[PDB]
Amino acid sequence: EVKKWNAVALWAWDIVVDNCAICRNHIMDLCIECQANQASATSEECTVAWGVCNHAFHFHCISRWLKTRQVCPLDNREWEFQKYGH
Amino acid sequence: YELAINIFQYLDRKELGRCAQVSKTWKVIAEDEVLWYRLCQQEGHLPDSSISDYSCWKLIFQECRAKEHMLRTNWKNRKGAVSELEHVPDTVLCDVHSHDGVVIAGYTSGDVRVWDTRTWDYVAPFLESEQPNVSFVRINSSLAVAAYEDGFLNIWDLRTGKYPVHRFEHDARIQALALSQDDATVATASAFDVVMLSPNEEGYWQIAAEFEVPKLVQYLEIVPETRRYPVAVAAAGDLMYLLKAEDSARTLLYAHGPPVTCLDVSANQVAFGVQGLGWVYEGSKILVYSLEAGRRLLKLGNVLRDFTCVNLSDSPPNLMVSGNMDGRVRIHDLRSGNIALSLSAHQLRVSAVQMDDWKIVSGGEEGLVSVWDYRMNQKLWEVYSGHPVQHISFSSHSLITANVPYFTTHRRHRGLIRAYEFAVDQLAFQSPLPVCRSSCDAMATHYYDLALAFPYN
Amino acid sequence: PSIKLQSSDGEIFEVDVEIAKQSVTIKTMLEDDPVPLPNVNAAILKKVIQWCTHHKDDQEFLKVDQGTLFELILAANYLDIKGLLDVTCKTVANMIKGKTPEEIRKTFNIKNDFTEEEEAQVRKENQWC
Amino acid sequence: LRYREFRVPLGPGLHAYPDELIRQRVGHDGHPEYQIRWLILRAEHILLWMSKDEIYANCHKMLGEDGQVKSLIQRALTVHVLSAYASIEPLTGVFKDPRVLDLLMHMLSYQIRWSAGRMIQATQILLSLSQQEAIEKHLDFDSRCALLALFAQATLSEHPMSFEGIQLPQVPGRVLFSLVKRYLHVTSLLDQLNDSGERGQLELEFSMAMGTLISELVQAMRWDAWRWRPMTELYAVPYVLPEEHLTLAEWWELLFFIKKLDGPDHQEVLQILQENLDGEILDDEILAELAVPIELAQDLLLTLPQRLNDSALRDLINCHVYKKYGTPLQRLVEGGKILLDLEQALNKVKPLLLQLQRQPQPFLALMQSLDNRTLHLTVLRILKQLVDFPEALLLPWHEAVDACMACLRSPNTDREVLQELIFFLHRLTSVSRDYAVVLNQLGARDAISKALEKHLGKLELAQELRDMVFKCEKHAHLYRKLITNILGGCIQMVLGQIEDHRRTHRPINIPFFDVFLRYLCQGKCWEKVEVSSNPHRASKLTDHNPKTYWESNGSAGSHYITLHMRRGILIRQLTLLVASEDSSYMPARVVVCGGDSTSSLHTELNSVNVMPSASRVILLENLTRFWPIIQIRIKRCQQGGIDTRIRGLEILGPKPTFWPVFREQLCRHTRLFYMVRAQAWSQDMAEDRRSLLHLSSRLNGALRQEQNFADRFLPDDEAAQALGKTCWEALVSPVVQNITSPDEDGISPLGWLLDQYLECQEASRGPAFFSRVRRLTHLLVHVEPCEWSSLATRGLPSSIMRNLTRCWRAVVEKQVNNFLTSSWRDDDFVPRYCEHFNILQNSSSELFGPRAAFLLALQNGCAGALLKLPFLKAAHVSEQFARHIDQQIQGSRIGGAQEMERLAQLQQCLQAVLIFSGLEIATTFEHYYQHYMADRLLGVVSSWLEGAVLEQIGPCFPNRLPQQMLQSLSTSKELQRQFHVYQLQQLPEVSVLVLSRHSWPVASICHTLLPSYLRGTLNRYSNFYNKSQLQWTWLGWAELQFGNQTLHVSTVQMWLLLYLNDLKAVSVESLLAFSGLSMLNQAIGPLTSSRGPLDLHEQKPGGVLKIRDGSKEWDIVRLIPPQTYLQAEGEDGQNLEKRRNLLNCLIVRILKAHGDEGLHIDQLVCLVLEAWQKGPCPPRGLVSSLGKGSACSSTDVLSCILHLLGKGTLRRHDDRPQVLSYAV
Ligand SMILES: [Zn+2]
Ligand SMILES: [Zn+2]
Ligand SMILES: [Zn+2]
């Protein structure tokens, strides 16, 4: 008696990063670049960047990744800096 | 040595900017006059020149681009000059058009004026006719056309005199008028006849073709850049025809749909907007047909209210601009069909739009003219005057705007035509058109002194 | 048609004249024992022969040392053959495209003979590109 | 000093202080006026007539409680007696009549010190003195200078003005005497006018007196519509609404000249007058009206300039009513005849001298001839024998001794001409020392010293000349002081007449007012041009006509233009005027070189490239050196042309100087006058607010009167525009500042008026009320200033727009707050709210026009009124908006009669909801909108309204989740296409839509769906997905066919009906055991209806159903459980509020723990999140107790941050704009 059905799925991707998944180190720490030549000229601008897609990266990491490819690495959404409340 | 220039000829400008830092001989081969002359002329700068009359063509190539950047910054701020065609006493503005910085205007007394906005001088002559209201006016690079209320049509040649070269007479009123942007053919739409006028080999202004339509015409355009016979597009209510003057053919592009709301014709395709209707409502749409075969290419629209204007013939390749009843202007991509920008610019409906490679200029029905920079996504400025904005036309260094009526504000008027000039170092001392000239040398010297007194950038 | 060429190396190279007439000088002396060819060796000759027979209407063809490519461009300068010149200049151009002045210095064995003040002040005005 | 808190800023570091009361009178309105002195300090004075109200409104401390004997004169017929007499208080005052004039006259001829100081210490006396017939006839030179010192003491000013910008003239004593007489007469007539049929006569006498004063002063100082415009001056000038007999002013300008004719000519002109104007001619009649027709005036003008002197004609020429109805001797005279007759017959000399002093132009030409030795010795003898004549002194010697001071500076030295020059100068300076004074002022002492004392021994009398000059050194400064005092007095008087014309509206009838104002406001460079090719056309380079050009004829590169400059003239600008019409005749490379002569031309100055589109080409900027010869070479033309064409040249030398003092005075006085008038008006506007409806007529009248004055008395338009800008900026800015600022209660006059305009539109007031309000508000915003010309822009940036916008914002916010407070719980809240907002927008656009600043003010007002709501009220409002949009979207699947109108209403609602963008309610709005859109997308296929609405209100969502939902809905179709293709290539229709966390709100999905034979397709799709890129849920819907019925069910219904078809009857036990659903009751609910096929025959255990509704025997049967809407009041919103109140304390803890330096926002968010997940201080008890609402995104923390910033608990750093810190 069944002729049509619209089944819905659910894809779980549960991975609590708590880290900059670009360089895999801590998110409040410094990235690999600023960790190699530490305190050479200036290091007070290795800051964090939040995306509309609710992910956080080092500014340097995500900036160079955007120089390479123009989406977000974790979710494959068109990247956009979060400016709500900023 | 010719081997060196054979190697460097294919070399682009960018890396040519670097090869001048590796040697002195490589410097003098990277500063060749023929290479930079070719780079300059092939890029558009200084078309009708000769490699002889200037020197160090690299510095010329630098100066032209510096000048273009200065022009862009003059657009971003408001630096330049501004002028306004003066009010005609006890009359109302009725229609406005402009082709190339030359404006034509018609008033509700039978008067028709032209005025060149490219000169330091000031002559706005009246075009003679040997009482009714003017219905439509059109201007060309050489011709001027006016259609009156009693069904008459005057045609002036802007290069001979201020008297008509042809006087045509209809039987009913005139519902639409069109003039070829390049060629010298005119098209009119009386009650049920559409006719094309054109000069024969001896220049006698005869009738090229005649057609018939089943309804009243509301829009009528002429396809630009036709080889031998002109082609027109008419919009009779909910029907859209394709008139070909070759054998007086009347093709039918689109039928059995909602009424048409706007129309624009480029050399290859035609874009027009249709309402939304139905018990189960169908939204308003913009359709883009092709003139080659008559096959529809696109069908756009995601709007709750009707479209009111569209510009395709002035837009860059693969882009189109439109304005809607909710007061928003939109940029449509012709390849993918998606939206590229939706911008809330006005309060009432949008009545005129135009776009170029970096900016949009749009005028609304409440009287506002607004300029937006869609490259950086920032507003530039806006100007408010009394009545609805009816005509808008800009070039790379100038802008023309008209507010035409149908207590509105403090500064009252009855029609206002305004010109903005964003590079005053290009204003001439007299008009290229013979009719746009005078003989009272007093005024000539007056405006000459005024021109010499104006500041510099 | 068959005509012989007397090369620098002393070897004689006979080839069908018509398709080889793309060199204006050889056909010039033809319509005006072989013709002496005293400026270039045989390898360039057979290169251009198999090239012209291939091209009636050569990416890999030029994957050789720089010196021999210079010799072939100078030959086509003497040969006055449009195709050889066009293709060799095109490949050298695509070779030099997209590089830094020092990458040019690597590309064409040219040493940087510019002092430092000159190196700075040259790349302050020339920046526009 | 005394009143320091009442100063008025007149510009940058320039203020005005009220100082003191001076005079008093009755105004034109019968009320008292008070003259008040103001002081301008960064010290000048300004006198201002003010009424009592203006004093109260501008400086009220000047109020307090209310409005602030005989024989002694006969014995002199013995001067100490008269001095001790004049020592008395009323003695000299009463004795003014009995010949005290002649007494003090003969006394003046240090004993006179007391006699002249007594009465003067204890204006009409000095006037009586200055017109004594024997003032200069019977007196000496020493007492003359004593009288002049007395006068210079009388006419001093406590605060003069700088005069070192103009060339003060040199004049003899008689000129100063006449000037002092006229000045004192005018002052007496003015003060008579202040303390007062007869007044008409007084005003006529005053006008004629001041006309004569202006004429004498100007002669003594020898002072005689379409266009492009900058784009920044587009709307900078205020706009004023537009609107057969001689006027009294113009007729008086002519009566002034009629009143100075000789008896015969006067009689003849009065006869010509009596001809047309019949009757008699009386003094009180000729002036009163004597209305003349224009033709009579024109013929009178045509016959007038003949019967006049030289000065009278010099005046009449520049007049306004006239500009409306208009041997060496013979060899020198050849360029007059009376001069030759005098030179020959120099006895009938007296008539020649008399006819000479009437028109002494030949005399001046003769004396100027000196500055060749031919005529000098011929005319010096004539001059020296003319000095010896009685009345030849009347001739203007002082006006032609600039020539004499050029021979004493010439190379010719120790000659005969110098000896005779010295002798003649000696004779002239010995007959009257006044010329010694004028010489000393010219600088004759050091001149003759360096010219003869170095060469020869005092050729004739040079030592005595130097002595006399050094003697009159002292009187020179007295003469200068006197003339400058009179000039300053006349300037103050004209300023006073202007102010009186402003306060009253009586016209200005003073004859030469416009000429005097023009003089006060206003204080070739080459010998030859030589061209190479075509000489007879070089005149067209400087023709000043661009329709005429010079065309070359020569070889390529050989064309040039040569400029011979004049001596000393530097080059400020050199421009070339070309026309792009000439295609190949246009220049293409110009080189300009400079040299000392045509042969050297060595140093080139500039080289320019001309472009194909150029009209004005600048070749040389402001230079420093002087160049005798300048040559312009045209190297090559355009497109390799051979000949060139030039349309003009333009050479500009140094800028002139114009003494910029009177302009500053005019602007200062205008600004202060209007800044006082505005404060006077604001009091009337503040005491009775209804009077605001008359302000527009007053402002327009003021502007119209100012324009009418400027278009009649100012020289040009560059001044009229500056005065208009000054008047506007001074009159409107304080009025706006006053009517905009609130009061003790918190409402301003304009705010009250706009509130009435808004709230009275419901309907009363009437239409004229609204029209007048609109007129006022449109008048106030019609001028946009630019962010002479330097004088009008003197001051600070304007503050009109700022005050107006903030007032409008406050009005809008009060309205929206009243609406939201009154009705926020209603059932029809959203439609009425959107209608209110639409009314607000319409009224804003019809009050101020569609200007961006006022729309921004309106949006800020609504956004500020929305932030005064507690959390639960804002939650309820957001939920209502989301539910309304949802109902409107869903109601479109079935059509309607009026659908276009419904979609227009939806558009208005979207415009209203766009206010949430960037606030902190945006997260709650997005929450509810997701919750409804999810249930909308999984119940039907789709609607076209989804994308249409999202295109408008996309920015309102901080996470952009609905866009992702729609995109995923599109993507799933492509995934199913790919799966079908790969399935039919790698050999019960189903459609799979796969959700995720970053594309769907997966928070309310706890259960998970195997029960039937369809596991194959699901496992195939799972394998395909895992290969090309899973878990299933209880959502979705199915279409089933049941005999003659077609169905539309949910999944949790489809599976149950499948189980019922796979058996006879199934009970709840296996249902729950196999499914796990908790929900199921509401699922099997809708089957109980008549359309439902099942009957739940409850067991006597738990329940069991079977198909028993199919016994009693179409189209779609939508047996799907309908959607329910959330309730912000219930346990949903309260958990969100608890989460917000927890995040607030978390944020303030973490911020207080970092000090005043602060924290970067993107690190504050990370710290808050990492303390919320693994929270030691926020224990997991509450974090678990929250339940649905225990998840924390970054946008939630950002919304809490926005809330705190709004409350003030947090603070943004100024240097680094997105670093936060705890406050207080
Ligand atoms: Zn990283
Ligand atoms: Zn870093
Ligand atoms: Zn992401």
Author numbering:
A (entry chain R): 23 to 108
B (entry chain F): 121 to 250, 259 to 534, 546 to 596
C (entry chain S): 2 to 33, 43 to 67, 89 to 160
D (entry chain C): 5 to 46, 62 to 87, 114 to 122, 140 to 171, 175 to 187, 197 to 270, 287 to 314, 461 to 479, ...
Show the paper's wording.
However, the vertebrate-specific CRL7FBXW8 is of interest because it eludes existing models, yet its constituent cullin CUL7 and F-box protein FBXW8 are essential for development, and CUL7 mutations cause 3M syndrome. In this study, cryo-EM and biochemical analyses reveal the CRL7FBXW8 assembly. Instead, our data indicate that CRL7 serves as a substrate receptor linked via SKP1–FBXW8 to a neddylated CUL1–RBX1 catalytic module mediating ubiquitination. The structure reveals a distinctive CRL–CRL partnership, and provides a framework for understanding CUL7 assemblies safeguarding human health.
A cryo-EM reconstruction of a recombinant human CRL7FBXW8 complex, prepared by coexpressing CUL7, RBX1, SKP1 and FBXW8 in human human embryonic kidney 293S (HEK293S) cells, refined to 2.8 Å resolution overall. CRL7FBXW8 adopts a diagonal T-shaped structure. CUL7–RBX1 forms a ≅160 Å long bar that crosses the ≅115 Å long CUL7-FBXW8–SKP1 base of the ‘T’ at a ≅50° angle. CUL7 does not directly bind SKP1. The atypical assembly explains why CUL7 uniquely binds FBXW8 but no other F-box proteins: the interactions are with domains, domain insertions and sequences unique to FBXW8, and even those with the WD40 domain involve residues that are not conserved even with its closest homolog FBXW7. However, in CRL7FBXW8, RBX1’s RING domain is secured in an inactive arrangement by intercalation of its C-terminal residues between CUL7’s 4HB and WHB domains. The CRL7FBXW8 structure suggests the mechanism: the canonical CUL1-binding residues in CUL7-bound SKP1 and the F-box are fully exposed and thus could mediate the interaction of CUL7 with CUL1.
